[PDB]
């Protein structure tokens, strides 16, 4: 929850032991009280300008949550926070050395370093590992 | 002022291929299922409400988060007179889901209440030792 946005990547993994600062917990403690049924204690009393906007607000709260669970769901990394993969890093993506990425770098600058290359990494996890391991697992159950 | 040929795969690209060639292709049909004057909004909920259902049924079957998985429910040869290697090497999926369309409801009941319901009362009572 953005408390370490000026910290470094080699140090922000220390405070990330809290559940991304209880990231998703702020949603459930919100939608317990977003679903205060005073909206149902009125039926909004009408259709109003705000309730049009709230409806377009809850949808984005639904969709953009799902696009982050699905991508974690497909990567063999459902529900975890720090998982490793089988994909080898290609040095053509970034010729930065080891410590400069971790000890000597922010996060948002590192986004603009590989925002070009990000989409290639997405396919190169699924079709390289999570499509792939499931067949090789199923072969190991053939016996 | 751009353009190169295909590299990995396309959307629905394996939908004329065999099962053994389409089984390595499932992620492309898995990613783009969700992302893609009120009548856009009425589409943006049906696309969600269809995604949750298919997500939910995988959840009940002990098979959430995996793309493929196996169960212990036995295949019944009354459902298919097809031979084994004809299925995995000759039949496409689009043909295959016209052939087992009628039996589908029997299948889904005979996954949950058959096994994954039963694999929890058996599971919970493997304690006490």
């Amino acid at each position, epitope marked *: 929850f953005l408390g370490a946005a000026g910290s470094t990547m080699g140090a922000a993994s220390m405070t990330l032991t809290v559940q991304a600062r209880l990231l998703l917990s702020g949603i459930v403690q919100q939608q317990n009280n977003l679903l205060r049924a005073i909206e149902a204690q009125q039926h909004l009393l009408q259709l109003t300008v705000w309730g049009i906007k709230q409806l377009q607000a809850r949808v984005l709260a639904v969709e953009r949550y799902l696009k982050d669970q699905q991508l974690l769901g497909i990567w063999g990394c459902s529900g975890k926070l720090i998982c490793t993969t089988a994909v080898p890093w290609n040095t053509s993506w970034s010729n930065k050395s080891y410590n400069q990425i971790w000890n000597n770098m922010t996060w948002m600058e590192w986004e603009r370093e590989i925002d*070009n*290359y990000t*989409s*290639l990494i*997405y*396919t190169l996890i699924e079709d390289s590992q999570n499509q792939q391991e499931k067949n090789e697992q199923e072969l190991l159950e053939l016996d | *002022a*751009v*353009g*190169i*040929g*295909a*590299v*990995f*795969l*396309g*959307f629905l690209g394996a939908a004329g291929s065999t099962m053994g060639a389409a089984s390595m292709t499932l992620t*492309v049909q898995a*990613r*783009l299922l969700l992302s893609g004057g009120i009548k856009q909004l009425q589409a943006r909920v049906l696309a969600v409400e269809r995604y949750l259902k298919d997500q939910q049924l995988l959840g009940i079957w002990g098979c959430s988060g995996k793309l493929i998985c196996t169960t212990a429910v036995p295949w019944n040869t009354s459902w298919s007179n097809k031979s084994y290697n004809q299925i995995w090497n000759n039949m496409t999926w689009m043909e295959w889901e016209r052939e087992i369309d009628n039996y589908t409801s029997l299948i889904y009941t005979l996954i949950e209440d058959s096994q994954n319901q039963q694999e929890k009362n058996e599971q919970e009572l493997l304690e006490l030792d």
Partner: antibody
Amino acid sequence: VQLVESGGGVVQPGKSVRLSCVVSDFPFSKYPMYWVRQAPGKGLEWVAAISGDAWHVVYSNSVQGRFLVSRDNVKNTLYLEMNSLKIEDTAVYRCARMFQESGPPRLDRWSGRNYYYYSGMDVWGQGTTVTVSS
Amino acid sequence: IVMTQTPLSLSVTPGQPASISCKSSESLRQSNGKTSLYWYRQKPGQSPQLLVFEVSNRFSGVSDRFVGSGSGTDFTLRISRVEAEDVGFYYCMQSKDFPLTFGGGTKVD
């Protein structure tokens, strides 16, 4: 920066030479290149183009299949090899750099196909001249 | 695609404004949000030099009196108070797709 060519001159029909454009200072693997052909007393004709990673090559229709281009990002060179020469190929060749920078290829999600962006030119080399005659 | 221009000869003297337009067959608006039409000038006996890259922006070493505009098909380059060293040619160059062509080059004396 400095941008010239080499290997120019005059040959016969049916022959084959290869020029050599050499850049000076900018990072050469970052940028794509081009080739242009100004005929004497005429306008300009586009010839060719290479990607920055030397993977994408687009030729003109008239000189399609005859010529050859290539890169060497380490040696910072630029080659235009040519084959099956005709007399109407006698003109001024110019080596030219893209104005903007280019990125890496894009890979649209919906179809597994990359995309190399191509925009126009700012730095024309003064260029050699090849004449095809008897 | 095809893209020619007009007028070929404008033999003038310094002190007056004028304009050169390049006419487009295929309309130009790429999906990046810009219209890839590049206006630039050669001198006689010289490799050319960039006047303006886009129809909006300019290049380094360019006088302020070089203005350009146009729709997706109409395209216009206007030179206010035409300077004494405006000799040579003026090519209109597009960058929609391949093969990317040119104009004839308007001669200005």
